[PDB]
Write an enzyme that holds these catalytic residues in place. Structure first.
Site, short mmCIF file in Angstrom:
data_model
loop_
_atom_site.label_atom_id
_atom_site.label_comp_id
_atom_site.label_asym_id
_atom_site.label_seq_id
_atom_site.Cartn_x
_atom_site.Cartn_y
_atom_site.Cartn_z
N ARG A 76 1.88 3.13 12.33
CA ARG A 76 1.06 4.07 13.12
C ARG A 76 -0.10 3.34 13.79
O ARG A 76 -1.11 3.95 14.18
CB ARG A 76 0.57 5.21 12.23
CG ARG A 76 1.43 6.47 12.40
CD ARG A 76 1.08 7.59 11.42
NE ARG A 76 0.78 8.86 12.10
CZ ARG A 76 -0.02 9.81 11.60
NH1 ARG A 76 -0.63 9.66 10.41
NH2 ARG A 76 -0.29 10.97 12.22
N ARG A 77 -4.27 1.20 5.11
CA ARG A 77 -3.33 2.36 5.29
C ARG A 77 -2.12 1.90 6.18
O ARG A 77 -2.30 1.37 7.29
CB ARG A 77 -4.03 3.41 6.14
CG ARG A 77 -3.60 4.82 5.79
CD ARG A 77 -2.08 4.96 5.68
NE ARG A 77 -1.63 6.32 5.96
CZ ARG A 77 -2.19 7.41 5.44
NH1 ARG A 77 -3.23 7.32 4.60
NH2 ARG A 77 -1.79 8.66 5.71
N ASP A 80 5.30 0.42 4.69
CA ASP A 80 5.57 -0.80 3.94
C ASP A 80 7.07 -1.06 3.71
O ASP A 80 7.79 -0.21 3.15
CB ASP A 80 4.91 -0.71 2.57
CG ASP A 80 4.79 -2.05 1.85
OD1 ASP A 80 4.50 -3.12 2.52
OD2 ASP A 80 4.99 -2.12 0.57
N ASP A 82 9.09 -3.90 1.86
CA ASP A 82 9.05 -5.01 0.89
C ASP A 82 10.43 -5.50 0.50
O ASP A 82 11.32 -4.70 0.20
CB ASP A 82 8.32 -4.55 -0.36
CG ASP A 82 6.82 -4.42 -0.17
OD1 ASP A 82 6.36 -4.73 0.95
OD2 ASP A 82 6.20 -3.97 -1.16
N1 LIG Z 1 9.00 -9.94 -1.13
C1 LIG Z 1 8.18 -9.72 -0.15
N2 LIG Z 1 8.42 -8.69 0.78
C2 LIG Z 1 7.58 -8.48 1.77
N3 LIG Z 1 6.39 -9.21 2.06
C3 LIG Z 1 6.19 -10.22 1.12
C4 LIG Z 1 7.02 -10.49 0.06
N4 LIG Z 1 6.55 -11.58 -0.72
C5 LIG Z 1 5.43 -11.95 -0.10
N5 LIG Z 1 5.19 -11.13 1.04
C6 LIG Z 1 4.02 -11.33 1.88
O1 LIG Z 1 3.19 -10.16 1.65
C7 LIG Z 1 2.30 -10.20 2.79
C8 LIG Z 1 1.38 -9.02 2.76
O2 LIG Z 1 2.18 -7.78 2.74
P1 LIG Z 1 1.62 -6.32 2.44
O3 LIG Z 1 2.78 -5.46 2.89
O4 LIG Z 1 0.33 -6.09 3.16
C9 LIG Z 1 1.39 -6.18 0.67
P2 LIG Z 1 1.82 -4.56 0.04
O5 LIG Z 1 3.31 -4.35 0.18
O6 LIG Z 1 0.89 -3.60 0.74
O7 LIG Z 1 1.43 -4.60 -1.51
P3 LIG Z 1 2.46 -5.08 -2.67
O8 LIG Z 1 2.92 -6.46 -2.38
O9 LIG Z 1 1.64 -4.95 -3.96
O10 LIG Z 1 3.63 -4.11 -2.68
C10 LIG Z 1 3.13 -10.48 3.98
O11 LIG Z 1 2.45 -11.09 5.03
C11 LIG Z 1 4.24 -11.34 3.40
O12 LIG Z 1 4.13 -12.72 3.86
N1 LIG Z 2 3.50 5.69 -5.08
C1 LIG Z 2 3.36 4.60 -4.50
N2 LIG Z 2 2.34 3.83 -4.60
C2 LIG Z 2 2.14 2.66 -4.01
C3 LIG Z 2 3.23 2.13 -3.09
C4 LIG Z 2 4.35 2.93 -2.97
O1 LIG Z 2 5.35 2.60 -2.23
N3 LIG Z 2 4.44 4.11 -3.63
N4 LIG Z 2 3.04 0.91 -2.46
C5 LIG Z 2 1.97 0.17 -2.60
C6 LIG Z 2 1.76 -1.15 -1.92
O2 LIG Z 2 2.73 -1.72 -1.14
C7 LIG Z 2 0.79 0.66 -3.53
N5 LIG Z 2 1.10 1.84 -4.07
MG LIG Z 3 4.37 -3.05 -1.09
MG LIG Z 4 4.44 -4.94 1.81
#
Ligand SMILES: Nc1ncnc2c1ncn2[C@@H]1O[C@H](COP(=O)(O)CP(=O)(O)OP(=O)(O)O)[C@@H](O)[C@H]1O
Ligand SMILES: Nc1nc2c(c(=O)[nH]1)N=C(CO)CN2
Ligand SMILES: [Mg+2]
Ligand SMILES: [Mg+2]
Ligand SMILES: [Cl-]
Length: 143
Positions: A76, A77, A80, A82
């Site tokens: 669009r 905080r 995500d 992952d």
């Molecule tokens: N398995 C993975 N999947 C996606 N990004 C990853 C990753 N491992 C490391 N990263 C790195 O994570 C960086 C920051 O990503 P963010 O999406 O801001 C963290 P988040 O997903 O908000 O929290 P979280 O990692 O606790 O879930 C990216 O720039 C990327 O290089």
């Molecule tokens: N319930 C819930 N909480 C979160 C989530 C998520 O996907 N679901 N992702 C986060 C960081 O990437 C932090 N917290």
């Molecule tokens: Mg995440």
């Molecule tokens: Mg992420």
């Protein structure tokens, strides 16, 4: 290779953002979606969480480039995407930690994953079903 991607969106009405993101994942080249989990409502307003099985011929960091692009374009905080697992590979680089560094501590990641890959064995030999039993994470509610 089968990559498992977690989707998280915390918009008040996330369904269109998640569908846009899913479509985009399916448009990634040398890749296609295998299966999508149900959408789950999880406490943080709520997050919508889902897991995606993506077959891909891309290298991991090439897949990462695509997922990061979709976050910016469909963001669009924030939204995500992952990378939870990439085949059975262990990745420890500056850009990428695979398996996702915390997923085993998060019911909101493991439960949607268990729906679509109940028999999953992590690279360290841990069993997804066992982690779910031992941690006793409550089953999630569907969106
Ligand atoms: N398995 C993975 N999947 C996606 N990004 C990853 C990753 N491992 C490391 N990263 C790195 O994570 C960086 C920051 O990503 P963010 O999406 O801001 C963290 P988040 O997903 O908000 O929290 P979280 O990692 O606790 O879930 C990216 O720039 C990327 O290089
Ligand atoms: N319930 C819930 N909480 C979160 C989530 C998520 O996907 N679901 N992702 C986060 C960081 O990437 C932090 N917290
Ligand atoms: Mg995440
Ligand atoms: Mg992420
Ligand atoms: Cl592992």
């Amino acid at each position: 290779t089968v990559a498992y991607i977690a989707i998280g969106s915390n918009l008040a009405s996330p369904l269109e953002q998640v569908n846009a993101a899913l479509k985009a994942l399916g448009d990634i080249p040398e890749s296609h979606i295998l299966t999508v989990s149900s959408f789950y409502r999880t406490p943080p307003p709520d997050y919508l969480n889902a897991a995606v099985a993506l077959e891909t011929s891309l290298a991991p960091e090439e897949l990462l480039n695509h997922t990061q692009r979709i976050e910016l374009q469909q963001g669009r905080r924030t939204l995500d995407l992952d990378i939870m697992l990439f085949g059975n590979e262990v990745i420890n680089t500056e850009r990428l930690t695979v398996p996702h560094y915390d997923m085993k501590n998060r019911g909101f990641m493991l439960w949607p994953l268990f729906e679509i890959a109940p028999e999953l064995v992590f690279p360290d030999g841990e069993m997804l079903r066992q982690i779910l039993h031992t941690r006793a994470f409550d089953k999630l509610n569907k969106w």
